[PDB]
From Swiss-Prot, chains A, B:
Positions spanned in the full protein: 3264 to 3569 of 7096
Catalytic site: H41, C145
Name of the protein in question: 3C-like proteinase nsp5
Subcellular location: Host cytoplasm; Host Golgi apparatus; Host nucleus
Activity regulation, short description: Inhibited by pyridone-containing alpha-ketoamides compounds 13a and 13b. In turn, alpha-ketoamide 13b (tert-butyl (1-((S)-1-(((S)-4-(benzylamino)-3,4-dioxo-1-((S)-2-oxopyrrolidin-3-yl)butan-2-yl)amino)-3-cyclopropyl-1-oxopropan-2-yl)-2-oxo-1,2-dihydropyridin-3-yl)carbamate) inhibits SARS-CoV-2 replication in human lung cells. Inhibited ex vivo by michael acceptor inhibitor N3. Inhibited ex vivo by compound 11a and 11b.
Domain Peptidase C30, chain residue ranges per copy: 1-306
Length: 306, 306
């Protein structure tokens, strides 16, 4: 049946994307009901970014300075406000395409889909994970700020990320939909460096369960281990420590495959110690950590949204 | 800015997906204007599949035997016909959500996005490539037949693939929207094995150009080569032969980076000969071949659709 990095269908989010321009800056906004959400740096000029005082810069702006365009139609802005690092622009029309939705702040290791957009227009969709150092590894060019990340359960879109910037190392940082940055990052041009990019162990294990369900079994072996023994190994390889909560989340996959979680941990431990010796797993030559256990079950069972 | 395997936004296609049931079989259909397209094996029972005579099985079916449901509403079927391996069910209502579209038969090495669906409901979206042996490497469970593959230019959706089956090795086979299978495959349970899965060289090169544009440059070197010399190497590694047409398509990337195509071919040749020695390129430990040169330019320039 196969296993691929899969994004959620994005049509429900495409219908919320709009362009926001303030003065000479144009980026993306998210229109839900009668509010348009966008990064507050829409009010900055490029030289403003080294050390912006957003509250002062915003004093010079009025509702008519924010130009919001939905596809070809212009929205009328009747109010604006700053919430942490996002601006909320109140418009006079509710978006007809607004899906059921929620805003959520995700935890590191959780995955979500990104709908990259430029000037209010979608360009593509891909899957991401909030890394342990709170950056994400995406694909964003200038003008893509304001593109969002989300997850979908049935018919409800949970928005969890809004894109704000690129670090000098090429990774990305952004905020939840309440405007709070994931991690320590700030919306200004300063020295901000990311911390260790540790591997999300529980996802690697889930992906090894997906591999076995799909026929890639060469890495299975005769050993087992314990959580404390496995974790010694994980520390050495900059892997996240595995907890009993993680073992418990892998329980459904453990049950479906008949492979105890600790036995899979023993497989992963040999893989870390000896490498893959030139072989591949689910088409990869390295250990994938951007699938959560929920993702593997979802995809191995065909869940759908409406 | 980063580079990721990215699917096209799928909302324009989500609005075309429907469920089709015939007797005891349920799968997906594609509703464009007033025709619903679906695999003809919707008329088969599981035992029919070993050696189906579709034309005979279809004699026993009338318009009212095909149940088509769009979300929660039922469509009225006023005509049905077989075209190669697809059935076309004429319905009495044009789909309101039909996007501008075209049907195209793609060539091996070209990429497209798949909107996996079950029972007429989207579950996810991912990027694929028509492999040289005409199979695709997807993620499909039972009930996913009828899910389609497509590309989008601006506002026009070009549909290029409809899913029909899984081979015993786990790869997938299907048809264009005219019902002709890609490759030698047939819609019955027989011994069908895929040929060599050769690597699409021109895409690997495009992806090396994307890597350099993104800062991964460790593989660049002091050498050059020729097309005939490079091709000796490609044959040894089961890579597609590179032609002058391929060099020409990489011309725009060659121009933007200042790296002549043959010099990149020399980099790829060392990579094939020596491996990656434990290093990665654009986050991968192997050479990616599912990005076309058009894909790299599109994504490195932020093209959008409306
Ligand atoms: N790549 C960068 O140097 C950069 C760029 C921007 N964008 C505004 C220009 C922002 N930021 O948005 O604050 C911050 C950073 N930074 O490293 O802290
Ligand atoms: N995995 C298979 O053995 C298989 C399954 C199906 N599906 C119908 C059950 C089809 N086919 O659709 O023709 C063909 C094959 N085949 O290998 O040729
Ligand atoms: Cl991917
Ligand atoms: Cl890899």
């Amino acid at each position: 049946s196969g296993f691929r990095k899969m994004a959620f269908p994005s049509g429900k989010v495409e219908g919320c994307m709009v362009q926001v321009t303030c003065g000479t800056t144009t980026l993306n906004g998210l229109w839900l009901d009668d509010v348009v959400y966008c990064p507050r740096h829409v009010i900055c000029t490029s030289e403003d970014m080294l050390n912006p005082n957003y509250e002062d810069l915003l004093i010079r702006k009025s509702n008519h300075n924010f130009l919001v365009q939905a596809g070809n139609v212009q929205l009328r802005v009747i109010g604006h406000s700053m919430q942490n690092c996002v601006l909320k622009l109140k418009v006079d029309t509710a978006n007809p395409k607004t899906p059921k939705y929620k805003f959520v702040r995700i935890q590191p290791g959780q995955t979500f889909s990104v709908l990259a957009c430029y000037n209010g227009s979608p360009s593509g969709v891909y899957q991401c994970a909030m890394r342990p150092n709170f950056t994400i590894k995406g694909s964003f060019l200038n003008g893509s700020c304001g593109s969002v990340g989300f997850n979908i359960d049935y018919d409800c879109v949970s928005f969890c990320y809004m894109h704000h910037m690129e670090l000098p190392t090429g990774v990305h940082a952004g905020t939840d939909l309440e405007g709070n940055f994931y991690g320590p990052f700030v919306d200004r041009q300063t020295a901000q460096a990311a911390g260790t990019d540790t591997t999300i162990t529980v996802n690697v294990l889930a992906w090894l369960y997906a591999a076995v369900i799909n026929g890639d079994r060469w890495f299975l072996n005769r050993f087992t281990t314990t959580l404390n023994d496995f974790n010694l190994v994980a520390m050495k390889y900059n892997y996240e420590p595995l907890t009993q909560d993680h073992v418990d989340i892998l329980g459904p996959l453990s049950a479906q495959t008949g492979i105890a979680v600790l036995d899979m941990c023993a497989s992963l431990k040999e893989l870390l110690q000896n490498g893959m010796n030139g072989r591949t797993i689910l088409g990869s030559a390295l250990l994938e950590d951007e699938f959560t256990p929920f993702d593997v079950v979802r995809q191995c069972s065909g869940v759908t949204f409406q």
